[PDB]
């Protein structure tokens, strides 16, 4: 079980997160700086977010040994995922929040019926509060319940390049990111983030309380910023390379605006239409719960 560590499940250290800065790994805090910010004459307003309708898909138990945690990490960051929004996997998960259910979430991220001995997991109460909230994403696709997209992205930007006087205020000028590069760097970081066990960071974002939370948000303010950037890459429209001195540089065109497609079909990772339907309803939950 591992019970739960007080101060997070992310303070354990068995499973952490390191972006591979080429031949040598690093920490998310250490990577953010290699990037600078260019203020352009465009402005976004921080728009309020609507509440999420409470109606997570009912319990079914088809027998699949569903890799729910693996599926989640794949769509947001994964390189060209397929059938991400199919209905069967989530429905199975929602069974989890149920008081008294022989169905334990494996530590490795695989869900089971009944149990096992050889495999340690997360105590049933930690997962109960988790699936209470991320089961809802399941039906994000329905015509009626479906979430926005062209507007949640007014938040992505403040975090990635949000100046402190800017996230203190409401409006931030449209920025333009640019950082050093190794050519295959955009895909390379996206290939890397896929294995962070992003389950651990979320299954504890619903279990931590009033003080343990105040300390959690003030430390992992990076581990969040990271997956936000890699995600904001697929969305922004034009990638321009600058050849200076003996250096080479990647510019991400606009941090805060949904172009609606492409980014660079070759220079980065792309988002299908069944991705904007997903990544959107995702951010609508983590953001709200986050703040």
């Amino acid at each position: 079980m591992l019970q739960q560590p007080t101060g997070g499940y992310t303070t354990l250290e068995q499973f952490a997160f390191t972006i591979r800065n080429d031949g040598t790994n690093a920490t998310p805090t250490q990577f953010l700086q290699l990037l600078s910010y260019e203020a352009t004459e465009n402005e976004l307003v921080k728009k309020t977010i609507p509440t999420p309708e409470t109606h997570l898909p009912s319990a079914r138990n088809v027998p699949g040994n569903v890799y729910i945690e693996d599926a989640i990490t794949q769509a947001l960051f994964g390189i060209s995922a397929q059938n991400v929004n199919a209905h069967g996997y989530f429905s199975r998960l929602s069974a989890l929040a149920l008081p008294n259910t022989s169905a334990r979430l494996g530590l490795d991220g695989v869900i089971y019926n009944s149990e096992t001995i050889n495999i340690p997991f997360y105590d049933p109460a930690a997962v109960a509060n988790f699936a209470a909230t991320y089961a809802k994403l399941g039906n994000a696709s329905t015509p009626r319940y479906r979430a926005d997209m062209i507007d949640i992205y007014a938040h992505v930007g403040l975090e990635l390049a949000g100046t402190d006087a800017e996230r203190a205020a409401g409006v931030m000028p449209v920025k333009r990111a640019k950082f050093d590069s190794w050519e295959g760097s955009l895909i390379s970081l996206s290939r890397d983030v896929v294995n962070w066990k992003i389950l651990a960071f979320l299954i504890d974002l619903c279990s931590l309380e009033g003080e343990a939370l105040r300390a959690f948000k003030t430390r992992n303010r990076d581990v969040f910023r990271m997956m936000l950037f890699i995600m904001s890459t697929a969305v922004a429209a034009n990638v321009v390379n600058r050849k200076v001195t003996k250096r080479v540089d990647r510019v991400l065109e606009y941090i805060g605006v949904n172009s609606m497609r492409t980014a660079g079909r070759t220079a980065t990772i792309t988002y299908d239409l069944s991705r904007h339907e997903f990544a959107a309803k995702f951010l609508q939950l983590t953001f709200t719960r986050w703040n």
């Binding site: 050849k243 200076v244 001195t245 003996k246």
Partner: protein, 49 residues
């Protein structure tokens, strides 16, 4: 104490996008005999056809 003979490659700009060619192209030119106006015209024609 006399001089010598070297080449510069125009590295004293340190400014990119110029000075693309290097030392060796001059060595090939000096290696060449000498080309007259009508010889150059003939040489252009031959490589073209």
């Amino acid at each position: 104490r006399y001089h010598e003979s070297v080449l510069e490659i125009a590295d004293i700009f340190d400014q990119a996008d110029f000075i693309q060619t290097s030392d060796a192209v001059r060595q090939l030119r000096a290696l060449m005999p000498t080309l007259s106006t009508s010889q150059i015209r003939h040489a252009i024609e031959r490589i073209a056809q």
